Design an enzyme around this catalytic site. Structure first.
Site, mmCIF file in Angstrom:
data_model
loop_
_atom_site.group_PDB
_atom_site.id
_atom_site.type_symbol
_atom_site.label_atom_id
_atom_site.label_comp_id
_atom_site.label_asym_id
_atom_site.label_seq_id
_atom_site.Cartn_x
_atom_site.Cartn_y
_atom_site.Cartn_z
ATOM 1 N N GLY A 155 18.519 -65.553 -46.921
ATOM 2 C CA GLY A 155 17.735 -65.635 -45.693
ATOM 3 C C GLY A 155 16.788 -64.471 -45.472
ATOM 4 N N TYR A 162 10.673 -61.456 -32.308
ATOM 5 C CA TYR A 162 10.999 -60.196 -31.659
ATOM 6 C C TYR A 162 10.333 -60.204 -30.301
ATOM 7 C CZ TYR A 162 12.549 -58.916 -36.280
ATOM 8 O OH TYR A 162 13.212 -58.879 -37.489
ATOM 9 N N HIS A 173 12.081 -47.053 -41.431
ATOM 10 C CA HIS A 173 12.697 -47.882 -42.464
ATOM 11 C C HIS A 173 11.623 -48.467 -43.387
ATOM 12 C CE1 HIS A 173 11.166 -51.010 -39.856
ATOM 13 N NE2 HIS A 173 11.312 -51.877 -40.862
ATOM 14 N N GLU A 175 11.275 -52.092 -46.053
ATOM 15 C CA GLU A 175 11.818 -53.427 -46.010
ATOM 16 C C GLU A 175 13.006 -53.585 -46.928
ATOM 17 O OE1 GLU A 175 10.929 -55.573 -43.571
ATOM 18 O OE2 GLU A 175 9.594 -53.974 -42.891
ATOM 19 N N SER A 273 7.877 -62.233 -37.655
ATOM 20 C CA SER A 273 7.813 -61.528 -38.916
ATOM 21 C C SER A 273 8.686 -62.132 -40.005
ATOM 22 C CB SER A 273 8.094 -60.034 -38.733
ATOM 23 O OG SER A 273 9.471 -59.716 -38.645
HETATM 24 ZN ZN LIG Z 1 9.880 -53.346 -41.054
#
Ligand SMILES: [Zn+2]
Ligand SMILES: O=c1[nH]cnc2c(-n3cc(CCN4CCC(c5cccc(C(F)(F)F)c5)CC4)cn3)nccc12
Ligand SMILES: [Cl-]
Ligand SMILES: [Zn+2]
Length: 338
Positions: A155, A162, A173, A175, A273
């Site tokens: 997934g 969001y 961070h 990805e 996203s």
């Molecule tokens: Zn990100």
């Protein structure tokens, strides 16, 4: 191309905007990947949905109250999972006097207010809602179906919604599997972003290890927990190159492999996203340093190495592949533009 590694903004025409994968290769040929983050403003004629007036009863299964602890540019964010709420209930909380965006003139005033008040009055983030706000017929940049090389996993290829409010944040961070990401701001108040160029990512990690030594001893990739907030002033004090940009409604943000990013929401908004890949990501996927403490998002790289790197498949499955990644090189697909 792009020696300064600054954030680049693109304005494609309708013809350029049709092929998503070819456009990513175009912005890479222009060196946009060097910044770690790029903005794509779509043509005025393009819209992913006619109206957002029918989503009041859309469920946010796990809103998170974000509790921020810290001082002098260094913060840790803790999540408290609240029970399911609707967009209607969230919008009512986001717009209330307790949670509303403070009055401001320019971004810089709002940015100062953010870094000074992020530990007070914990906001609620309608984060990681499984779903899409794109209509069925939308064939261009449909986040729920990008048609990239990432599809060969199934997934990680699914879209997430969001729902933001003022002061809700996303910590430093990269990805999962150091993949690319696309973020579309559907409606509402802006979302501000900070990025560190992929060529300076290790400088940020070394800095983060120095500030949270216990967290580093307990996890090989502690920044992957997405709990560390570091102000631009702190980054400037320790010589970390970074750039900032503000995303407005109807604009896309593209994150590139090993491009560290953080940011905050100016007020009530909604972003969609997902993650995606190009041929260039493959090497980043193979070399990715994953979170050791939690059992985390992991992709088997064998299927990718056997299809796009056949000559090196046996050498890599042996453990002798000593490829040093050059962060400045564009994706192979960018050849046509170069
Ligand atoms: Zn990100
Ligand atoms: O605006 C954002 N809000 C929240 N999370 C953001 C973000 N990520 C979140 C993840 C975690 C995804 N995970 C669950 C899969 C990865 N990137 N990256 C950029 C932007 C945002
Ligand atoms: Cl709305
Ligand atoms: Zn971990």
């Amino acid at each position: 191309l792009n020696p300064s590694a600054r954030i680049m903004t693109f304005y494609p025409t309708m013809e350029e905007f049709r092929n998503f994968s070819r456009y990513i290769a175009y912005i890479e040929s222009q060196g946009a990947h060097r910044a770690g983050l790029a903005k794509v403003v779509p043509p005025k004629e393009w819209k992913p949905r006619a109206s957002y007036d029918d989503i009041d009863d859309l469920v946010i299964p796990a809103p998170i109250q974000q509790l921020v602890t810290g001082q002098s540019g260094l913060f840790t964010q803790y999540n408290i999972q609240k029970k399911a709420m609707t967009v209607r209930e969230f919008r009512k909380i986001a717009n209330s006097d307790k949670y509303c965006t403070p009055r401001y003139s320019e971004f810089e005033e709002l940015e100062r207010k953010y870094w000074k008040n992020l530990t007070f009055n914990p906001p609620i983030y309608g984060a990681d809602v499984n779903g899409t706000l794109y209509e069925k017929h939308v064939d261009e940049w449909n986040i729920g179906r990008l048609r990239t090389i990432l599809d060969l996993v199934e997934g990680v290829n699914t879209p997430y919604l969001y729902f933001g409010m003022w002061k809700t944040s996303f910590a430093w961070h990269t990805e999962d599997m150091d993949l690319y990401s696309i973020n579309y701001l559907h409606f509402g108040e802006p979302k501000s972003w900070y990025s560190v160029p992929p060529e300076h990512g290790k400088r940020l990690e070394r800095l983060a290890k120095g500030f949270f030594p216990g967290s580093a001893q307990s996890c090989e990739a502690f920044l992957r927990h997405k709990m560390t907030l570091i102000s631009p002033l702190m980054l400037k004090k320790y010589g970390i190159p970074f750039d900032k940009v503000t995303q407005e409604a109807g604009e896309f943000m593209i994150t590139f492999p090993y491009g560290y990013h953080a940011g905050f929401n100016h007020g009530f908004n909604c972003a969609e996203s997902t993650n995606f890949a190009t041929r260039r990501w493959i090497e980043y996927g193979k070399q990715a340093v994953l979170c050791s403490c939690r059992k985390m998002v992991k992709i088997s790289m064998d299927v990718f190495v056997r299809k796009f790197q056949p000559e090196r498949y046996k050498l890599w499955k042996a453990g002798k592949d000593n490829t040093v990644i050059d962060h400045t090189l564009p994706t192979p697909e960018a050849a046509e533009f170069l």
